Amino acid sequence: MKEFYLTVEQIGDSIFERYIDSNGRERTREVEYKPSLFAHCPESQATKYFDIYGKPCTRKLFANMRDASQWIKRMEDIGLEALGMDDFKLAYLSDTYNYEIKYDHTKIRVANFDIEVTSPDGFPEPSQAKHPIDAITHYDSIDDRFYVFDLLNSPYGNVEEWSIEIAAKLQEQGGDEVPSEIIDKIIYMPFDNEKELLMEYLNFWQQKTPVILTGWNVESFAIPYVYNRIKNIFGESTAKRLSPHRKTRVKVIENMYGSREIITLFGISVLDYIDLYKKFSFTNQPSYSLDYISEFELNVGKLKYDGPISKLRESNHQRYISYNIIAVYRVLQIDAKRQFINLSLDMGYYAKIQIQSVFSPIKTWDAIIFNSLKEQNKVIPQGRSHPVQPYPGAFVKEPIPNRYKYVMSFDLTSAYPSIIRQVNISPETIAGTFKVAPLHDYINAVAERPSDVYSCSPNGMMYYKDRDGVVPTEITKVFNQRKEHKGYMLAAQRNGEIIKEALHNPNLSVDEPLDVDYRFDFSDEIKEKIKKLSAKSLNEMLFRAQRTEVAGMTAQINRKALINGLAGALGNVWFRYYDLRNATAITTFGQMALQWIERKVNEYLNEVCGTEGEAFVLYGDTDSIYVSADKIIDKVGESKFRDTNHWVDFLDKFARERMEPAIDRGFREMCEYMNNKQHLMFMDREAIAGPPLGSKGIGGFWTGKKRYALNVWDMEGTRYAEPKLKIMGLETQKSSTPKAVQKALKECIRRMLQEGEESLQEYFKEFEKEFRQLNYISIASVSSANNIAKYDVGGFPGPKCPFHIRGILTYNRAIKGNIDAPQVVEGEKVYVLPLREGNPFGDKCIAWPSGTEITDLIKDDVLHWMDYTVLLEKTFIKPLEGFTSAAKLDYEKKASLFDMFDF
DNA sequence: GAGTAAGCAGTCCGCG
DNA sequence: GCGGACTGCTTAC
Ligand SMILES: O=c1ccn([C@H]2C[C@H](O)[C@@H](COP(=O)(O)CP(=O)(O)OP(=O)(O)O)O2)c(=O)[nH]1
Ligand SMILES: [Ca+2]
Ligand SMILES: [Ca+2]
Ligand SMILES: [Ca+2]
């Protein structure tokens, strides 16, 4: 097989690489790597190395990596550019794997682990590690085994062995309900003292050395706790055995809020799953506890136990160990669904970076572009310092706040990357400039055509048509990968809907789910069988379909993120190819595009409807337009339609057969106008929205920019079995809005959009009537707790103190001297509740860590003093007021002359 | 060390 | 009691 790297590190003048050899065996090697860098030379000098602008360079081959670094300094002291890859492990990887990396995941050791630590004195800080590590579950992807390290004897209690028989029993049977599919995979190792447990853990670590190290919060908790604990017991160099190359760094992160210390284990690629989740999932959760995310991603119940975690090992060791094991499994289950480890690996090897560098689009693209240019013997520029400057982004049309009955939306395929490719925007494709007209002049086709010769953006930039830039070339490769996966996700999504329609009439027989590939639209024959299947079979199929759609989602959305990342990175000063002319070329072309096509669409629709100057485009943002289809519908008359699906079919056909061509024609003209390399402005229909036919539903509404609601029947070709709400920006979409209020507001919106004013009024009355009976957590607000110290004036609120911070300060005072009350962590999320005046907390609000029940010592008082009135007004009524007034609708029956009668 | 646009809640402060 | 300037947080794209 072809060889591929596992990890690479630079240590002095040495490259340390773990790799898989041709026999598929894991190896390590120290390499005295001899780097190269480049200096411009005169034209007189024969060379095969040119920089990106075509200037000749001379190769400087250094005897070691320090030599190359010193040379960079000397070049700075002279005032001349030092060209080439300055991150030597990237050059090494590039030189060592000069071919497309084909990797095999079954040879890559992936470790998932979680430790337990009993603490009678509050949170066990990793930097101190003054408490015994009393459990470790470590899952090894190559043995496919959960290795369990269990401390029986500890200063905090001596316990009996954990029972695999009891762990496997149902909870309702006194057992721990450890999932059956992993019972046979547990290897249990009890220990009578800490020292032998850790020694045995290290010895096992050397034998099964992680390549990818993951789990939940491993980077901030488990890894540094294990390191510092081993350090304190055995010494630093023993703790250093956690590194395959016996090198570590007690690191520091430089950002915006705080000052922490994590451990860099050299020769290991750490991907804390919480970080993967935050980057790749595109959710913002009110909490990031594993219980919460597990419930969210998998619909498994919260791991139940009695009393604090600081007493769990002693009161119920049986459950303590089982839960340690289950928590490890849960991350594996989330990854089986989301597939972020697979994605990370795909991207890492594609770019030829250290795998942990997937968190940095900038690093990722620097490597991709470097490897691309090197193939053509081109020499990359030296990174330069730049001052941070703001620059303009997208256009957003101010919408008229209102209800909007029928709406058809259209949006450009991969807009920013497509602009890059259309205009040929790259550092080396710059041809010059032209004198700009005001933007509106391009929008309205009155401005002098920018160029006969070059490809242009209305920002003033000109690019070569006759040659490809490394940016367009490489962004196109990743775009095409993205396209393929979106194709799979949408097919699976459509297949899902075929299955949901078939569940309306489930057959009564014993059958099996069909062996199909959900990535491709079901054949007619498959559709026929589906119509005969049992409910059991169908639901299993729906599950499989939905798991396929999730996988395509992960793979498509994050390749999209990567390419969109390339466009944004051009405006980041740390990017080697930083250039505000290129960044601005994209955004400004985007602004023109959106407003250009708004004009063309109003023109076209006025023409086909035989009217003039009517406004069909009601709203737009970045690359999207929203079209009022009321007149399209009135033109034919609502009477002519059989059911809802009939008119959805009409507008679908209208968009595809009439509008899109007119849109295409409009953009091809703009392409010619800007003399672009390639026409790539593809604006496909997104949503088809309206009320159910015959209903009092209002279809949709806008309250302002980025704030709207649509009852959608078809989305990018997916015809839903049931209408689905498309809500953007409104409180139901915000993680700060309480759970039960999101739910309540959404149901209000659903009623407005599908049923009408009377239905809405009915529901509102009920909610206000019953809401006081909701669980306090479900009605608590959520906020990130940033810069807490800044507003802490002797335990009390300082000036300009934010509401949620004041609650944190209220919490701190009420738990002062409470030994095991959970401390709020700076930068993390809290629940927040308003308090009635005269409460025994002495302030107007309280806040405690999200995802957790509030400590029982102050829960009582919180429940008693919660201010339901304020909580409803603030989170529910006031947003609902915004929705309804914009929609010209009432949530409560207004007073009227009819009040004089008895109905 | 991907980007900008833009909405809403809240504090401070003015207002016979 | 509510506006406007201000920060903080959060979303749409
Ligand atoms: O996180 C983001 C989101 C958007 N955009 C910019 C760049 C985006 O190109 C642009 C439009 O945003 P969408 O309509 O959501 C996306 P796109 O067109 O990428 O992908 P489709 O083919 O529609 O799934 O906004 C960003 O720069 N960053
Ligand atoms: Ca735990
Ligand atoms: Ca788009
Ligand atoms: Ca059937």
Ligand SMILES: [Ca+2]
């Ligand atoms: Ca869009």
